[PDB]
């Protein structure tokens, strides 16, 4: 599409998210979600092919259903208290409908099914935007009304999301489905700490976004969407594979990497509330994510796979487009554990 | 079956190289004779001459910060005092009973 049109659509997506995050009226939050949905579809359908159209249709259906449920919860809450301000829910039925709608918007289990489908359908840039920027608004709304949420339902969905992400990522050879299931598991980790500390939710979101940005930019640079395609990257650009391996180590939560910071803190926070069993199950389940990250690391940099003859031609050329923020993203997603107490900045 | 029975184009596995062939007096460090000799020399000087001898001498003459001689002198003077004064050498109570307040049972 026209670059001016693309810029306008991206700025409309961002303006919808900002309208969600700056408003105090439920109607304006709903309008921000609507604007974001409206401007998101062409971005997903930018590279026109039937797969992207199918993904855009699935995304539109799920997000429109979530918006309808959100409006239903808003109207019930208005019925039981003539309030439009985002604060308390004022009704058990309105809070359940609201949590369901926001979980469907985020992709939390049991509403996770659309995430791998849409992420596989769309390109790598659309998947980057979808898995990073589209979580800011529902999570901000959840952070605002967290004192209303029933901890049982939120914790159930968080544990389900962690389990589903772990088990579903084990079976994947496509990189985009791996990213989708990783996103699902990280959403589960984020929403399990909302009832206790929203600061830890925001910290986990920041760390996850940094790691996901680095991972997607590395995947775009070495333009591979398949495990075997990524196995060829060492014969052209081994440093990219090494950075990818260290980033995958960070994504698995292995200390002393950056990805260890959220889970640790989250576990720490949950122990202050006499919650012991659930963090233990969460860590043991995140071991599965680490396992399939290790499988990818084996396939990418730790061993050298067979190549093809035509690769020699690729040795003679350099990337025309380079990413300005990729080195900063790699360093931030790898080496910020010593700076952990800075989380008091209420990020 | 038109296949070459070859799965891929691969280098043949080479035969291992002998350092003693191109260089007798090879010391087994490096294929460059000068680098080889100097690597031998630095290993021997810093491993045997410096660490193994000077470090052993340093450990042998470490000052008595564990206070073994001090403890023996304290025990000697304490025994000398107690033998002379008729005291019963070591006591069974490590702490003075008068500064311990026991809880009354009264059962």
């Amino acid at each position: 599409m026209n670059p001016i049109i693309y810029t306008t659509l991206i700025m409309t997506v961002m303006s919808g998210t900002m309208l969600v995050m700056i408003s105090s009226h439920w109607l304006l939050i709903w309008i921000g979600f609507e604007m974001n949905l409206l401007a998101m579809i062409p971005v997903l359908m930018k590279n026109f092919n039937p797969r992207a159209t199918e993904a855009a249709t699935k995304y539109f259906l799920t997000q429109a259903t979530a918006s309808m449920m959100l409006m239903m919860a808003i109207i019930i809450n208005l019925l039981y208290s003539g309030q439009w301000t985002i604060t308390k829910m004022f009704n058990p039925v309105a809070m359940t409908m609201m949590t369901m709608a926001l979980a469907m918007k985020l992709g939390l289990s049991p509403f996770h099914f659309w995430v791998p489908e849409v992420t596989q359908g769309i390109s790598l840039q659309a998947g980057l935007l979808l898995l990073t920027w589209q979580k800011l608004a529902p999570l901000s709304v959840l952070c605002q009304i967290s004192q209303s949420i029933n901890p049982n339902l939120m914790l159930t969905m968080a544990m389900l999301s962690i389990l589903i992400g772990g088990w579903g990522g084990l079976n994947q050879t496509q990189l985009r489905k791996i990213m989708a299931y990783s996103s699902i598991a990280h959403m589960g980790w984020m929403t399990a700490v909302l009832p206790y500390n929203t600061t830890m939710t925001i910290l986990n979101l920041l760390i996850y976004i940094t790691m996901t940005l680095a991972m997607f930019m590395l995947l775009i640079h070495s333009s591979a969407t398949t495990t075997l395609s990524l196995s060829h990257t060492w014969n052209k650009m081994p440093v990219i594979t090494s950075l990818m391996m260290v980033t995958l180590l960070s994504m698995g939560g292995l200390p002393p990497l950056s990805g260890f910071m959220p889970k640790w803190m989250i576990i720490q926070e949950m122990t202050k509330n006499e919650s012991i069993i659930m963090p233990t199950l969460m860590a043991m389940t995140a071991l599965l994510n680490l396992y399939f990250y290790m499988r990818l690391a084996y396939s990418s940099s730790l061993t050298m796979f067979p190549s093809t003859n035509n690769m020699k031609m690729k040795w003679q050329f350099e990337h025309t487009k380079q990413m300005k923020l990729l080195p900063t993203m790699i360093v931030l997603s790898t080496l910020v554990l010593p700076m952990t107490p800075a989380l008091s900045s209420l990020n | 079956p038109p296949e070459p029975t070859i799965r891929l184009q691969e280098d043949p596995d080479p035969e291992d190289e002998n350092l003693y062939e191109k260089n007798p007096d090879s010391h087994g460090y490096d294929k460059d004779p000068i680098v080889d000799l100097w690597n031998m020399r630095v290993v021997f000087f810093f491993g045997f001459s410096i660490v193994l001898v000077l470090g052993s001498t340093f450990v042998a003459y470490l000052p008595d910060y564990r206070m073994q001689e001090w403890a023996r002198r304290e025990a000697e003077r304490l025994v000398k005092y107690r033998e002379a004064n008729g005291l019963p050498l070591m006591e069974s109570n490590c702490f003075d009973p008068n500064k311990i307040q026991l809880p009354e049972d009264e059962d």
């Binding site: 390109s123 994947q172 495990t227 061993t303 050298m304 | -």
Partner: protein, 40 residues
């Protein structure tokens, strides 16, 4: 004398649509290299 490195038969373990092929998922075919299907 030589460190082992993956050959074709090892790399072909990771070329399916999914890991751990099963009878129900045996018929599944990997997506096209470019994410474009024939229009038939």
């Amino acid at each position: 004398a030589r460190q082992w490195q993956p050959d074709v038969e090892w790399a072909e373990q990771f070329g399916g649509a999914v890991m751990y092929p099963t009878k129900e998922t045996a018929h599944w075919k990997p997506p096209p290299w470019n994410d474009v299907d024939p229009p038939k």
